[PDB]
Design an enzyme around this catalytic site. Structure first.
Site, short mmCIF file in Angstrom:
data_model
loop_
_atom_site.label_atom_id
_atom_site.label_comp_id
_atom_site.label_asym_id
_atom_site.label_seq_id
_atom_site.Cartn_x
_atom_site.Cartn_y
_atom_site.Cartn_z
NE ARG A 179 -9.75 -8.62 -12.32
CZ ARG A 179 -8.59 -8.49 -12.97
NH1 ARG A 179 -7.62 -7.74 -12.47
NH2 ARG A 179 -8.40 -9.15 -14.10
CG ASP A 244 -5.09 -8.76 -14.51
OD1 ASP A 244 -5.18 -8.81 -13.27
OD2 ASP A 244 -6.07 -8.52 -15.25
CB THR A 245 -0.79 -4.18 -15.99
OG1 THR A 245 -0.11 -4.48 -17.22
CG2 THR A 245 -0.22 -5.03 -14.86
CB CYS A 350 5.93 -0.12 -12.96
SG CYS A 350 5.37 -1.12 -14.38
CG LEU A 351 11.30 -3.53 -13.90
CD1 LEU A 351 11.89 -4.92 -13.98
CD2 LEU A 351 12.40 -2.49 -13.98
N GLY A 352 7.53 -2.24 -16.51
CA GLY A 352 6.80 -2.22 -17.76
C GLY A 352 6.07 -0.92 -18.05
C1 HEM Z 1 -0.86 0.31 -16.41
C2 HEM Z 1 -0.01 -0.73 -16.28
C3 HEM Z 1 0.79 -1.10 -15.19
C4 HEM Z 1 0.69 -0.74 -13.88
C5 HEM Z 1 -0.33 0.22 -13.27
C6 HEM Z 1 1.78 -1.37 -13.17
C7 HEM Z 1 2.06 -1.17 -11.81
C8 HEM Z 1 3.15 -1.73 -11.13
C9 HEM Z 1 3.36 -1.60 -9.71
C10 HEM Z 1 2.46 -0.86 -8.72
C11 HEM Z 1 4.50 -2.27 -9.41
C12 HEM Z 1 5.18 -2.39 -8.04
C13 HEM Z 1 4.51 -3.34 -7.06
C14 HEM Z 1 5.30 -3.51 -5.78
O1 HEM Z 1 6.05 -2.59 -5.40
O2 HEM Z 1 5.16 -4.58 -5.14
C15 HEM Z 1 4.98 -2.85 -10.65
C16 HEM Z 1 6.07 -3.71 -10.74
C17 HEM Z 1 6.49 -4.34 -11.93
N1 HEM Z 1 5.84 -4.22 -13.16
FE1 HEM Z 1 4.31 -3.05 -13.66
N2 HEM Z 1 2.56 -2.14 -14.05
C18 HEM Z 1 1.92 -1.99 -15.28
C19 HEM Z 1 2.32 -2.65 -16.46
C20 HEM Z 1 3.37 -3.57 -16.54
C21 HEM Z 1 3.69 -4.35 -17.73
C22 HEM Z 1 3.04 -4.17 -19.10
C23 HEM Z 1 4.73 -5.17 -17.39
C24 HEM Z 1 5.39 -6.02 -18.27
C25 HEM Z 1 5.41 -7.36 -18.13
C26 HEM Z 1 5.07 -4.86 -16.00
C27 HEM Z 1 6.17 -5.40 -15.31
C28 HEM Z 1 6.52 -5.12 -13.98
C29 HEM Z 1 7.59 -5.79 -13.27
C30 HEM Z 1 8.49 -6.91 -13.81
C31 HEM Z 1 7.58 -5.31 -12.01
C32 HEM Z 1 8.48 -5.75 -10.87
C33 HEM Z 1 9.49 -4.72 -10.40
C34 HEM Z 1 10.22 -5.16 -9.14
O3 HEM Z 1 9.61 -5.89 -8.33
O4 HEM Z 1 11.39 -4.77 -8.95
N3 HEM Z 1 4.24 -3.89 -15.47
N4 HEM Z 1 4.14 -2.53 -11.72
C1 LIG Z 2 1.30 -5.54 -8.53
C2 LIG Z 2 1.64 -5.96 -10.05
C3 LIG Z 2 0.80 -4.97 -10.94
C4 LIG Z 2 3.10 -5.95 -10.44
C5 LIG Z 2 3.14 -6.50 -11.97
C6 LIG Z 2 2.02 -7.63 -11.92
C7 LIG Z 2 1.59 -7.46 -10.37
C8 LIG Z 2 0.21 -8.09 -10.10
C9 LIG Z 2 2.76 -8.03 -9.53
O1 LIG Z 2 2.75 -9.12 -8.97
C10 LIG Z 2 3.90 -7.01 -9.52
#
Ligand code: HEM
Ligand SMILES: CC1(C)[C@@H]2CC[C@@]1(C)C(=O)C2
Ligand SMILES: [K+]
Ligand SMILES: [K+]
Length: 407
Positions: A179, A244-245, A350-352
């Site tokens: 943002r 930022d999630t 999502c991995l987190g």
């Molecule tokens: C409510 C919380 C969260 C939401 C809604 C969220 C949502 C997402 C979404 C939509 C993607 C896929 C984006 C795409 O396909 O381009 C993603 C990917 C990912 N998220 Fe989360 N996320 C959250 C929390 C977290 C947290 C706490 C971490 C930890 C650092 C994290 C780590 C990742 C990683 C490493 C990926 C990459 C997966 C890949 O590209 O193979 N996320 N997340």
């Molecule tokens: C779309 C996301 C929520 C996901 C984790 C951080 C984020 C901004 C990315 O660049 C991959």
């Protein structure tokens, strides 16, 4: 407007819907409500907005899901709008498509996955309780800064073995990527995040710790040593996910609970429903929206997409789609089939999310047990903010200390 890019020759005039990702017109009604305008009666499944440089937008879960599944046509190489941001975006494994994406995704999964979350459980529990107890007697708080930010962020910094005093700088940088306020372009914020990591990564490759950074920096990808450059591109992503999630989601959930005593009472009376409530809240208050870039000309749902075209595939919209959930704007903790793509869809799921659900469920449980009754500060006009990840500007909460209880 001068903020409208000329409509390209191949994009049908009738499909134009000038939705602004970073400042949706109906924002005052709530960010999810603002994006839902894309799902009103006469809006097609796929529209083109001339805002932010011009790009496609899939407005329904069916298309969003299909596109996220077809990585051969919809590449993650340029995942962010505007195009400049998408081109600078080189985080691993997110900027890669299968098959090359996999070896890196496996490593990332090892640093933030379930096994790691199970290990953090007690510390997550302790921090939630510690923060809520200190707030309890005060009868008020600025939720975004007093809990939403410190809780998830400190846990991530603990996992990454980074000093909490570095949070102000890092958080400012991550927010410019999702943002942007205009002070920094995506490229500049990315360069500063990488600049921060470079010496830390070098330090931990020489003397490895047990933190997430050390694990990544000293990890292997399908048998071969990860490079310094690769570790940087993966760690940068982890920082963004950590800062930022969940931070934003918690505020959406608590704003809703503060305005709905009946729902709070439901979880108070029947706490065993908290996990289900968590999933329903994740659907209703979904907040992410990134996308893909077309690898070649391709006809999708009767629309001619051209190579290079960017397409926003709002993870947020799937679960708000009435074709996926009846009365989508209604929060029903007993909702039979909670359909959504809040954590993404396809090879980039999502991995987190496991760390995220743990943080959410812990928050709901520990807060309601100590501060069961609370509301929005009188007269407060809550403002949401829209972007790759949407949020809440501020959430002033109030309560009578007399109605609380130490646990
Ligand atoms: C409510 C919380 C969260 C939401 C809604 C969220 C949502 C997402 C979404 C939509 C993607 C896929 C984006 C795409 O396909 O381009 C993603 C990917 C990912 N998220 Fe989360 N996320 C959250 C929390 C977290 C947290 C706490 C971490 C930890 C650092 C994290 C780590 C990742 C990683 C490493 C990926 C990459 C997966 C890949 O590209 O193979 N996320 N997340
Ligand atoms: C779309 C996301 C929520 C996901 C984790 C951080 C984020 C901004 C990315 O660049 C991959
Ligand atoms: K045209
Ligand atoms: K790129």
């Amino acid at each position: 407007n001068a903020n409208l890019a000329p409509l390209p020759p191949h994009v049908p005039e009738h499909l134009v819907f000038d939705f602004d990702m970073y400042n949706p017109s109906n924002l005052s009604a709530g960010v999810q409500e603002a994006w839902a305008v894309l799902q009103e009666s006469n809006v097609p499944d796929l529209v083109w907005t001339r805002c932010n440089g011009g790009h496609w937008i899939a407005t329904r879960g069916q298309l969003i899901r299909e596109a996220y599944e077809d990585y051969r046509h919809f590449s993650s190489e340029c995942p962010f709008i505007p195009r400049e941001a998408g081109e600078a975006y080189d985080f691993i494994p997110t900027s890669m498509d299968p098959p090359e994406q996999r070896q890196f995704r496996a490593l990332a999964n090892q640093v933030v996955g379930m096994p790691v979350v199970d290990k953090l459980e007690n510390r997550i529990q302790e921090l939630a309780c510690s923060l809520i107890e200190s707030l309890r007697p005060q009868g008020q708080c600025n939720f975004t800064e007093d809990y939403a930010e410190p809780f998830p962020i400190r846990i991530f910094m603990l996992l990454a073995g980074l000093p909490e005093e570095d949070i102000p700088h890092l958080k400012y940088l991550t927010d410019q990527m999702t943002r942007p306020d205009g002070s920094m372009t995506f490229a500049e914020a990315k360069e500063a995040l990488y600049d921060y990591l470079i010496p830390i990564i070098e330090q931990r490759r020489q003397k490895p710790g047990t933190d997430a950074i050390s694990i990544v920096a000293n990890g292997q990808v399908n048998g071969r040593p990860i490079t310094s450059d690769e570790a940087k591109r993966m760690c940068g992503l982890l920082l963004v996910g950590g800062l930022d999630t969940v931070v934003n989601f918690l505020s959406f959930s608590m704003e809703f609970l503060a305005k709905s005593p009946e729902h709070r009472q439901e979880l108070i009376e029947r706490p065993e429903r908290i996990p289900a409530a968590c999933e329903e809240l994740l659907r209703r208050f979904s907040l992410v929206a990134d996308g893909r870039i077309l690898t070649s000309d391709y006809e999708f749902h009767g629309v001619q997409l051209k190579k290079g075209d960017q397409i926003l595939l709002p993870q947020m919209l799937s679960g708000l789609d009435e074709r996926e959930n009846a009365a989508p704007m209604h929060v029903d903790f007993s909702r039979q089939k909670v359909s959504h793509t809040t954590f993404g869809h396809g090879s980039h799921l999502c991995l987190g999310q496991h760390l995220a659900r743990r943080e959410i469920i812990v928050t709901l449980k520990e807060w309601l047990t100590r501060i069961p009754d609370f509301s929005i500060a009188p007269g407060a006009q809550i403002q949401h903010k829209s972007g790759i990840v949407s949020g809440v500007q501020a959430l002033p909460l109030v309560w009578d200390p007399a109605t609380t209880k130490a646990v």
